[PDB]
Amino acid sequence: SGEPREEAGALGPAWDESQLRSYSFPTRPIPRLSQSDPRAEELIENEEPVVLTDTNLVYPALKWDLEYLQENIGNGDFSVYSASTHKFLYYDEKKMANFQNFKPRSNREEMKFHEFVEKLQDIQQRGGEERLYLQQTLNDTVGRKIVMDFLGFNWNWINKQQGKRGWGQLTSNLLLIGMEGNVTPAHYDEQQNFFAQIKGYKRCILFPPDQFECLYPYPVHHPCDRQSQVDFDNPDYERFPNFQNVVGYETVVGPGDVLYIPMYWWHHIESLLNGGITITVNFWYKGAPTPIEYPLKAHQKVAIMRNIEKMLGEALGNPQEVGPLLNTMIKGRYN
Template structure:
């Protein structure tokens, strides 16, 4: 089947999207039985997949009222930010860490465990100038009987067929995201394959392929912001990060029932559209399949190699402040363009 027409009426327009200094191409949109879906997945390219019914029970039922009534008394992980940005950090890498100038790391967001009712009431009562909220909770048996039953009734046959066809590893986790409108998860990459299923509202995802690595300026692997870009897309510092101006990305806006495939090691920047109400999303993270070495290597394999080299150097030197100078000394005068 052909991709859906871009002429279809959308419930959002450019005023609901944040403005950035780059122009982006479009992620293709195909019906689930279009062979081009699997062509994209095999090629490690993002694609919006339509008509899967993957999270149909959630699309039909899950809104804030339903979640409040059915998620039970379990505590949920909620992040708070003084801005619209929710930049992930690794708590295990935070202890005792400082940058080369000796400045201690300060998390840009804080975490709190909340009952679902308290979270929803706080979000509904939110006023401009207050901390923003973003719930990110693993879907487990503790989330409430009805939610669990909805989860069981997802279209596991379809998604399992993709896992098998593309020889991925096991499903590692499902995260439930409940976000205020306008919230942003800044640009980062994951080391797993990801089906990103939209349940309520609209999200925009800007993606950059692994071959744009040098344009994205990732934090070092030892840093709490490992896998995150150092570039602030709202106001990029082109003096510190000059190659970011050359970055070439694609974008997708996905709505209820649509599934975005985010390939392993692809950078992605995710925002809940502004002035469009809260959003609910469920993602499906899978381990990568067995590595098949074929030359030339694929770009995501090169990123994996770079990470492993950086980790090994850190393990030997034991001082993260020495990693950068050593790697620069290896390159300078030997492998210059």
């Protein structure tokens, strides 16, 4: 992640090591480049991450904070997630029927922005362990002023990018507001992503698709599909031996930086400790349609594994049988 950058006007270090959580694996830096740099386009075209420092993608939102947002976003309701710890356990509600024993670890809740702002205060007053994360799409369903800021994003840049990479439609666009210390555990998404930081700092640790064997994702039919089964804060090396070979790409993004997270790449995101609240807006695009050229890329093998798991759960008429069948196929035959 490197030596903390110095803020303009001698305001000092943007952050210091004591704000970063400690992990068991090594990491090297993600390149930090200007969007006009030919190396930045090269990295994106080859689907490798890059932090673009001067896109002006969310320029108007740089002034956003809780006051400004509460006072201009509207009286609509927002999805707020809460967790007993720093780690947010998200899950797919639609898959809970496949695992009756799964007990949810995170709760969503609809509330008004000021209610969110107020619940935030208390947790700071008492200092409880509870944490929250607000997540909402940028529609026209929000305040007029927020809509103007939104219209002011650099759509020229991102649209051009979307066009040259061959990506599909902008599938999702989320505003995220979190508390210092918040951590979104490692997982991968099937879409291309531009992560635009707005307020505060977030440490992003990415792992290429070829580390599948070291990250142990949950069964595709499980509510936590696409998330790593390993507890980064207490890795169980007996159940997940290859987590000892994992190597990541790291960076700390701040106001104005845009991080490109290529599709299928794992990412672990954390809001720096004692760094104040964080605000980010993500942009997701469907990747480009498959051209079959060999040798296959790692993410294409991951896609094949996901498909085999899905087909099996349908053919057997019950996802709980997938594992027993796979083991039967392999033992004494391929292992």
